[PDB]
Structure 1
């Protein structure tokens, strides 16, 4: 299995933590200065909140797919490259959509 990662740059981290705790009925899995994440089972989602400093509105930071093991990351990396996309591998692999939105496929 795998789940989507959504990372949002938010103007107010504390405000956003409260909102998302209510929306998904669970508290954050990890909290750091300027950073929080939620691990949501239903719907399957890794939500990342990154505080933006002087942001007027929430915007997309990056997107991703969190997968079960490094083998899956390698499979995705090879398949994406075979499909003709430019990739950057780190475990994770990055690709960028034509409008500039970045995607990471990674394992935690």
Structure 2
């Protein structure tokens, strides 16, 4: 199986303006739009961009990060590898790990 892409989830103050900006930046409209969130599936560069409405803030912040893989089998291998590395993990197919500075990561399947 074995390929993957980065999930970049941004907490944004202005969702509507952000959708417009990122459509222009990556040259494609969003794949999915709902009240309070929108996501882009970008081929080049390979990226899953998630825009999360945060009307409470006044500046774009990092919401969370992720590795998006092809199937559940890849998640398992990732989950086991992270555990062997000595990283404290929580595994459901999903696995969550948090960096030293508090940035949340998730390895999940599309």
Please give the range of the TM-score, normalised by the shorter of the 2 chains.
over 0.9
- How do residues 1-108 of structure 1 correspond to structure 2 at under 5 angstroms? 1-108=3-110
In the alignment, the residues of structure 2 paired with residue 48 and residue 60 of structure 1 have an alpha-carbon distance, to the nearest angstrom, of 10
* Structure 2: gaps of 5 or more residues: none
* Structure 1: gaps of 5 or more residues: none
In the alignment, the residues of structure 2 paired with residue 35 and residue 97 of structure 1 have an alpha-carbon distance, to the nearest angstrom, of 24
Secondary structure of the residue that 1:60 maps to in structure 2?
strand
> How many correspondences in the alignment?
108
Cα displacement (A) at 1:90: 2.1
Aligned alpha-carbon RMSD (Å): 0.6
Secondary structure of the residue that 1:50 maps to in structure 2?
strand
Cα displacement (A) at 1:91: 1.7
Deviations 1:53-82 (A, max 9, x none): 221000000000000100000000000000
Which consecutive segments of 4 or more residues in structure 1 shift more than 4 A?
Answer: none
Tell me the TM-score normalized by structure 1. 0.98
